[PDB]
């Protein structure tokens, strides 16, 4: 009855998965907490089991991680980079089966699950180079015979809490950067993607163990909100990177602030696409379709608001409706499938409530709006017109494929409407107007962390910093100098002279 | 008689080498030039043969590379980085056989041959990350409604001329960086390491082929000075990276300057180690030995001058002599061996000439000084005392294991004596004094491009920029922002408004 016992899913064993798997790793494998069975969202079948972390498991793992840090922080960064290079290699070796497991346990289509593993492989390669670059400037001191240098050192233990929607890549972004920065990591993933968490940890553990490194450098404590809360409260967790709901993220931030820890918060998005009258509609329509229905609308960066200039609103909505009707629904691992299930039955519940609420607030469902009558957690990708831009439901993040469509007339008002929500993750305008594009990018433009032109709100690349503003939580991951969040800056003044001149020319004698 | 036809050298075939090899690669393999045989400097046996480039080969190769550039410069930098990543992997998979070829044809010991291939693997890994990073700042314009962007673009065709002593890694540094910067490469290596050049190019070519890219992205034209001079004079070679002797590099520099090209010169070194009275002698002696005799004294970063404080001069000399006597000499592929042959008989002759000139200028050979009596190009690593720091022979760079030892008393003079030569590549002090170390690193310290403390003059790592000042030519390779030498900067102002406000507030 478990999928992992059926011959058609024996590829799962290529990841080292079994009927029941240890969900704690700290150099040894265990798990004395509750046993969780995870399910395939496309057919509601159970896949396999994971023994989760008890509180005693959490405690011992934190200690072993902090013991491992003493060794790992002593290893020169480029040598830590080499470890991350081997992790990249080990992921490349398993990218198809790992991508398939993402499609199976999480529910996104296979090209997206493989693509998610590729994001991790890519950030690994990026971090290898970074391991020879991280640091700060040597600055010219105003004092004769003094050196002034900005040093960067690891913060220590980086707790990483991740959500279901990207059960591989988010951890990967955090882990590759944290590792080359000399931190140890402790991962608590979404309970409903526990096999993914275990399978990834199995890959990393083999690299660490083959290199005779303490496995706790990349520790795993599978569990629920109780483990996550313990991490938020744990003085030994020097940085807590939390990707998840804004509501939970706000509590995580408060807990970490209460103990003067560091948090990196990657929270909700309410991402708008804006199509101006001069837009290339052959870009707008497919970009909106992918941004809205990709991952069944379950990305932090999913397009949730579509603003269309009055002149082209009806045409775009009609073209969008014709495109939605061609979406190929099915099992996310099957060929030519573009659209799979939502991740849980609760997600279907939230989808239905949001559709209901949209109607109660005056919206019209012009496409979709229903649960699909078929095995699994399938819903129709949904388009809603007629709501005011400030309708409560439109300002709410519903992690589901509902696209709220609005009319607008002029640039100033629609930029303001993009910015009026509490979320601040991604945003996109479709236009040919040069000045408009640079205004969008400027101080009176989009207030989001990702500000795009003529592309969807989703699908960032790893070379830039990824994250948002306002209720999205302010953290950044991946590229640019995001690595600085995983390290502590020191400003270091070295007097190598025989005199003591004081800053600002102060004479104290 | 060819070693590649003998059974114990069949491993050469794992690099795709055969009895006669094509020395031109531009996407297809060819070579209408003179056939050169290369020889093993440990025993003077012929290894295999390479058909070098004719000038018609050179001409067709340049044209193919520049057409390949139009494809390659359109490929996003991160995707170019992916190609270089795969070159790293293919080198990694051949590191043993390639290192062995370096030991066979060039003559350095096996651990340095492997280590040199590792340097190329390392710069590949570094360039992959750089390929997602290269670029310039977006700057705040003083003008409303204007953007100000610093852009970087490939220069086009990068010619790479390399020397015998690092016949893999030098090309590797230039190749990895030039590629992610969007350039195509044309390589002319040392004729006496032609097999190494072909073997590296075979590895790269397979990667380009497997990725459906034109092979001319990494072109090879094996040949001698006539080819190198053609590259220096060729307006189609946008950047010429030249690693070699100061004497040739100066003419390369002038030829490139005459046509308003770009040159990256990596030239000779006359590198000093300075041991102060407070130095840890247990660090000094091993460091000086490896720095002087590593690669049989044939690195541009080799220690050629050793300054020792009067108080410890005699002790350090005596300890260096006893350590030299323990140097293990033999064939460079035998695993126990620390010291192999010089690369050529001409290197033996230049060494002999330098030793006798040191004697004629008043120096004393306290260790070595003689050629050895075994097959190959072996000479004794040599220590000369008693010369003045400005002895004519001590200011010359002889590419051979001769270490000139001098006394000093004061920090100011020995810093000056470090700086007094024409070269300016590497330098090193051994001391525990905190103030002395930062003075060494400061404006009144070493004038060199590499300024080390308590490590020898050789053996840098890829994270930093590599190169020298003064007659070493000023080029930098590998790390930091050396990549900018392979790209052209543009300062770009975009007026996206309906107004034309003038810089500096000029009302015209
Ligand atoms: N320049 C001062 C700044 C102190 C600031 C403070 O006391 O709040 C210092 O470095 O001591």
From Swiss-Prot, chain A:
Abundant in hepatoma cells and fetal cochlea, ovary, eye, heart, adrenal gland, liver and kidney. Low levels present in adult peripheral blood leukocytes and fetal brain, thymus, spleen, skeletal muscle, lung and tongue. It comes from the Eukaryota. GO terms for biological process: aldehyde metabolic process; choline catabolic process; glycine betaine biosynthetic process from choline; sensory perception of sound. InterPro entries: Ald_DH/histidinol_DH (IPR016161), Ald_DH_C (IPR016163), Ald_DH_CS_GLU (IPR029510), Ald_DH_N (IPR016162), Aldehyde_DH_dom (IPR015590), ALDH7A1-like (IPR044638). NAD(+) binds at residues 162-164, 188, 228-229, 244-245, 266-267, 397. The record marks 165 as: Transition state stabilizer. GO terms for molecular function: aldehyde dehydrogenase (NAD+) activity; betaine-aldehyde dehydrogenase (NAD+) activity; identical protein binding; L-aminoadipate-semialdehyde dehydrogenase activity. The keyword Cell membrane does not apply. It is an enzyme of class 1 (oxidoreductase). The modification N6-acetyllysine is found at residues 64, 432, 470. Pathway: Amine and polyamine biosynthesis; betaine biosynthesis via choline pathway; betaine from betaine aldehyde: step 1/1. The active site is at 266 (proton acceptor), 300 (nucleophile). The modification N6-succinyllysine is found at residues 64, 507. It catalyses: nonanal + NAD(+) + H2O = nonanoate + NADH + 2 H(+); (S)-2-amino-6-oxohexanoate + NAD(+) + H2O = L-2-aminoadipate + NADH + 2 H(+); betaine aldehyde + NAD(+) + H2O = glycine betaine + NADH + 2 H(+); an aldehyde + NAD(+) + H2O = a carboxylate + NADH + 2 H(+). GO terms for cellular component: cytosol; extracellular exosome; mitochondrial matrix; mitochondrion; nucleus. The keyword Nucleus applies. Its EC number is 1.2.1.31, 1.2.1.3, 1.2.1.8. (S)-2-amino-6-oxohexanoate binds at residues 301, 459-460. Keywords: Acetylation, Cytoplasm, Disease variant, Epilepsy, Mitochondrion, NAD, Nucleus, Oxidoreductase, Transit peptide. Multifunctional enzyme mediating important protective effects. Metabolizes betaine aldehyde to betaine, an important cellular osmolyte and methyl donor. Protects cells from oxidative stress by metabolizing a number of lipid peroxidation-derived aldehydes. Involved in lysine catabolism. It is linked to Epilepsy, early-onset, 4, vitamin B6-dependent: An autosomal recessive neurologic disorder ocharacterized by a combination of various seizure types. It usually occurs in the first hours of life and is unresponsive to standard anticonvulsants, responding only to immediate administration of pyridoxine hydrochloride. Belongs to the aldehyde dehydrogenase family. Homotetramer. This is Alpha-aminoadipic semialdehyde dehydrogenase. The lineage of its organism: Eukaryota, Metazoa, Chordata, Craniata, Vertebrata. The gene is ALDH7A1.
UniProtKB/Swiss-Prot annotation, chain B:
One of its GO terms (molecular function) is L-aminoadipate-semialdehyde dehydrogenase activity. It is an enzyme of class 1 (oxidoreductase). Its EC number is 1.2.1.31, 1.2.1.3, 1.2.1.8. Abundant in hepatoma cells and fetal cochlea, ovary, eye, heart, adrenal gland, liver and kidney. Low levels present in adult peripheral blood leukocytes and fetal brain, thymus, spleen, skeletal muscle, lung and tongue. This is Alpha-aminoadipic semialdehyde dehydrogenase. The gene is ALDH7A1. Transmembrane segments: none annotated. Multifunctional enzyme mediating important protective effects. Metabolizes betaine aldehyde to betaine, an important cellular osmolyte and methyl donor. Protects cells from oxidative stress by metabolizing a number of lipid peroxidation-derived aldehydes. Involved in lysine catabolism. PROSITE patterns: ALDEHYDE_DEHYDR_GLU.
